[PDB]
């Protein structure tokens, strides 16, 4: 389970780096976060895996709700390349989207910090597969990058959406529902962590560089993400690499597996079994 | 305005 979770969290975070559909980026975010839970199972921390389930429910549900708010305002547009310039046009969805992204990336003392950071320390100081540990830390950096990608392309810069402006997030059903999850995305982790009874002996003694690894790699992820995002504004035209194509097309797994396996099975059915 | 919605019969 440790190695299954590690390849999952790394591979799906890599896929999210180049997705353009907003719902797909957040979908790959879930797969990456699920892989982290599977890593927590692997290092024998079931109650930490359970805590992440509870904290993740708040900000992940908000992120989809915020994306639905944007999609609705742009007449069912889901491509981030056609968003932009929404930071002031949709102030409340912006606030929720920023809070949700900060909770996902483990900003200290938001709901996501009370699970993920404990998970990273537990993994860092455990007797564990060294490769799985590295894949998990890199995936934590990639979380910062693809969260930056949503904020940068959806909210900042200049509008890239059509000319008839129909932006409107002033429905009380929309505001109130997101509001409650915003409050949860700030305090739920703190409230839960302070009320559950201890069932393990949490590891609290470690070197400084194992205690802050989650925060550092996340910050480096944000900085590196900003370099990439700003380079898209330079008047330079770039050819794609194999790594870019591999990330965009999801490692070719759906392309190969969803064509080959159905073909082989469906061909066996008619040619050999039936006829 | 309001437009007629074509639906299959729901009576039966």
């Amino acid at each position: 389970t440790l190695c299954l979770g590690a390849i999952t969290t790394l591979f799906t975070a890599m896929c999210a780096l180049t997705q353009n559909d907003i719902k797909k980026i957040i979908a790959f975010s879930t797969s990456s976060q699920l892989g982290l839970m599977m890593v927590t199972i692997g290092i024998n921390q079931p109650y930490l895996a359970f805590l992440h389930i509870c904290t993740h429910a708040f900000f992940k549900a908000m992120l989809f709700m915020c994306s639905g708010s944007i999609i609705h305002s742009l007449n069912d547009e889901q491509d981030i390349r056609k968003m932009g310039g929404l930071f002031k046009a949709m102030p409340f969805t912006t606030t929720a989207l920023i809070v949700g992204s900060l909770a996902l990336t483990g900003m200290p003392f938001l709901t996501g910090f009370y699970s993920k950071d404990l998970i990273i320390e537990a993994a860092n100081t455990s007797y564990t597969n060294a490769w799985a540990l590295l894949m998990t830390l890199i995936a934590t950096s990639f979380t910062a990058i693809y969260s930056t990608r949503i904020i940068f392309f959806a909210l900042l810069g200049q509008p890239r959406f059509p000319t008839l402006v129909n932006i409107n997030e002033n429905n009380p059903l929309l505001i109130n529902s997101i509001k409650r999850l915003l409050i949860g995305s700030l305090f739920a982790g703190y409230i839960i962590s302070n009320n559950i009874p201890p069932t393990t002996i949490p590891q609290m003694t470690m070197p400084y560089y194992l205690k802050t690894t989650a925060l550092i790699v996340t910050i480096l992820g944000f900085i590196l993400a900003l370099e990439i995002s700003n380079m898209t504004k330079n008047l330079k035209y770039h050819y794609p690499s194999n790594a870019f194509k591999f990330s965009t097309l999801l490692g070719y797994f759906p392309t190969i597996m969803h064509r080959l396996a159905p073909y082989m099975n469906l061909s066996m059915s008619q040619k050999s079994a039936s006829s | 305005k309001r437009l007629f919605i074509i639906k299959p019969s729901g009576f039966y």
Binding site: - | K1, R2, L3, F4
Partner: protein, 103 residues
């Protein structure tokens, strides 16, 4: 590479009919001709009564007088007992722990 005059004429004629058809989808004023905080608490008062109080009465009656009258149907984890606790059933007093080494 534009419409031929015959293509243009056909599109114009279908366009006239299509717009007439779409207009005829508008409902007339009478259609559909149909056959023959105090409030807020009351709305929430009736809901609490019918969806919480009535169900809990039924569940409590069912648990108390049918389920808990059979062995092992409801099994509780026995309460934790700590040094210095007093027991209600017996009145027994649990002794305290030793004196801790200073730390």
């Amino acid at each position: 590479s534009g419409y031929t005059p015959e293509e243009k004429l056909r599109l114009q004629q279908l366009r006239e009919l299509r717009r007439r058809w779409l207009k005829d989808q508008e409902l007339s004023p009478r259609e559909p001709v149909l056959p023959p905080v105090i409030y807020k608490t009351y709305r929430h008062s009736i809901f609490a009564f019918t969806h919480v109080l009535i169900p809990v009465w039924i569940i409590h009656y069912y648990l108390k007088y049918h389920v808990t009258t059979k062995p092992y149907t409801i099994v509780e984890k026995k309460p934790r007992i700590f040094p210095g606790d007093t027991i209600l059933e017996t009145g027994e007093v649990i002794p305290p722990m030793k004196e801790f080494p200073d730390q």
